[PDB]
């Protein structure tokens, strides 16, 4: 899934001094990451998660139908528990509690 960015970044350490190889790897990383930037931009600009592949780090989860009436009354737990951060897919930039 989102592990590709980690592989490219790990791969890019060895070719950090090679101009052509670094240019190609940087171009590939830039184009590949564009979807992730789209998800992040929509999340921070409109507060909407769009792509249903569960790729994005901010995991909004659906309430089960069996508990719909319960969660509607106690909206605090809906808005505090059913939004999570998927730690596996985070880059080192976001590996900070405050961010």
């Amino acid at each position: 899934g989102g592990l590709l960015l980690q592989v490219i970044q790990e791969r890019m350490v060895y070719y950090k001094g090679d101009p052509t190889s670094l240019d190609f790897l940087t171009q590939l990383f830039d184009i590949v990451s564009s979807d992730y930037i789209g998800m992040l931009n929509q999340w921070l600009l409109e507060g909407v998660i769009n792509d249903p592949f569960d790729e994005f780090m901010i995991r909004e989860k659906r309430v089960p139908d069996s508990f719909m009436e319960i969660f509607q009354s106690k909206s605090e737990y809906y808005w505090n528990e059913l939004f999570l951060i998927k730690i596996d897919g985070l880059l080192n930039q976001f590996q900070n509690s405050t961010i």
Binding site: V13, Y14, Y15, K16, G17
Partner: protein
């Protein structure tokens, strides 16, 4: 002079393959590509001349080995 002088254009046929650091039917590398054996039927003069030409082949082979070995292993940016 042909009747009175014996030695193996045939050299130039197999020389390009040796120059590019590859094994040849009359020139064979050995000892991890550190020495090259000049065959029999190459009299003194031609062998002495080839010893100068083959300097490029062995040196290039060593450089190619280094490049292929350390292509993406070294971590330091300078190297």
């Amino acid at each position: 002079i042909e009747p009175y002088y014996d030695t193996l254009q045939t050299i130039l046929t197999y020389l390009p393959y040796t120059m590019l650091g590859s094994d040849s039917k009359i020139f064979t590398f050995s000892n991890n590509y550190t020495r090259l054996e000049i065959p029999k039927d190459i009299n003194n003069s031609f062998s002495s001349l080839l010893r100068e030409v083959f300097e490029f082949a062995i040196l290039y082979k060593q450089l190619a080995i280094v490049v292929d070995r350390y292509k993406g292993t070294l971590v330091s940016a300078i190297k």
